[model samples]
Structure formats: C-alpha cells, structure tokens
Target: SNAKLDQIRLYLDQKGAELAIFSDPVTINYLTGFFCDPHERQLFLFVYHDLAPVLFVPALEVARASQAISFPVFGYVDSENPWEKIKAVLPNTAAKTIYAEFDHLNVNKFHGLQTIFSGQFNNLTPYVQGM
Candidate 1:
C-alpha cells in the first residue's frame, strides 16, 4: 500500500525536522500530487516543520509552475543573478546542518550548493533512493 502523506507529515512533526526536496518527477509527484519535466533549471519543494509547503520556481516556467500546484509559489528571474534571488528567499539559520537530495544532484550542481552553503550538508541519498 502507498504510505499516506499525512503519515510523513506526522513523522516530520515529531522529529522537528524540515523537508527540502528538489524538482525530480517521482518526488514531486509523490509529495505535491504533480510532476515536472526534467530540464536544466532548478525547482524546489520546501516543507517546514509544522508549516505548509512552498514551491520555488524560475521565471521562465512561472506560468507552468503555477498551474502545477496549490501551494505558495515563489519565483526567481532566469537571468545570471537568479541564484541571488533564490538565496534571498531562503531561511537563514546557524543550525550548521542542512539536508540535500544528493541522488538527484550532479557534481557540478552539488559543488555550487556547497560553495553557497559551506556548512554541514548531509546527503540524503539513501533516503531518497529508498523512496
């Protein structure tokens, strides 16, 4: 049987940890009830502990991204400074630990995020694959 999403929500509540998933088809579909086409740009689904999920999208796909879900949608420009826009909307904390979907991230992209984060970043590869 498919694990109910409410179960995951309850678990996260108990654990006091947030979930930040990348825009992979399986994960998006499983979590958001929608799927996205794979492309070069980045998309993210962020669910904080005890909070509603939010979707971050690039400007080029704003219209399409809007139609895909009913969550709070955030958009960033598709220019060279897009990452700057993304960083602006992200939560800033000194927690020192961040979880990433390593199985879904390539080397170059991983390196880029490492440069941006530069802290304890845990690769949730096994957990993602197990899904």
Candidate 2:
C-alpha cells in the first residue's frame, strides 16, 4: 500500500486545520505503512498539515512504528489510560481545526477525543473519499 500523505497535507491546508487523526486499522496502515493485526489494542495515526505526524500505537510496537514513519511516534502500555499519552502528544488548545475519520470513529472514542483537542474537529474522510 502507498501512503498519500501529500493529499492529506493539502486537505488540512484547505480546511485550515493542523491535526488529522486516523484510528481505524486500514487507514492507519494505509497512511503509515505499518499494519498491525486486527486486535483490541488501540492504534492511531496522527497527521498534521505542517508539522510532522505522530503515531500512537501499543507499547510493544514502539520500534516498528518508528521505523515505519519518519516523524514522532508515541506508545502506551496496556492497563494504562491511553488518554494520558494521547494528551501528552496533542496540544492544550489546537491552533486550528482538527480532522478525523468520522465513519470509523464511534461515539465512545469521539468522547475521548473531545477531552484532548480544544478545537473544532471535522471529518477528513470526505476529503480523501476518492483518494
């Protein structure tokens, strides 16, 4: 699979956004070139229109994720609240609008994100609908 990060960059520029979060396995793998098995462990890929992207993955995968991406990578161990690490990576208040894959992000997960980003979040999936 190819990672079309350029298109996403443009989408974020057009939206005047800074952050783009992808939680689903396929999208995560498609963008980062690291595909973990379909499991219960949390996996997320962060993309920014300007800054380097970050991937929040299981603690066990910290190495592989690093190798798969050129930007920063963060990992969390089981039994610990992933939100803490997630919070550490994200900004206290986003500089611009954030984007996410609305089709895959459920209500429960969305609530978690609400506590993290202090800005509006749009569905980025529509922008990449044909990509």
lDDT of 2 by residue, 23-104 (tens): 8888777777788763776677777777667778888988887786777788888878987778876543364688988998
Candidate 1 Cα misplacement greater than 4 A, ranges: 1-19, 91-95
In terms of TM-score, which candidate is strongest?
Answer: 2
Q: Which ten residues in a row have the lowest lDDT in candidate 1?
A: 1-10
* Cα lDDT of model 1 by residue, 15-108, tens digit: 4445444545677677766666647777766554445566777666667867867667777765655456556776642324455677776777
Candidate 1 matches the true fold with a TM-score of: 0.69
Error of 2 at 36 (Å): 1.8
Clashing pairs in 1: none
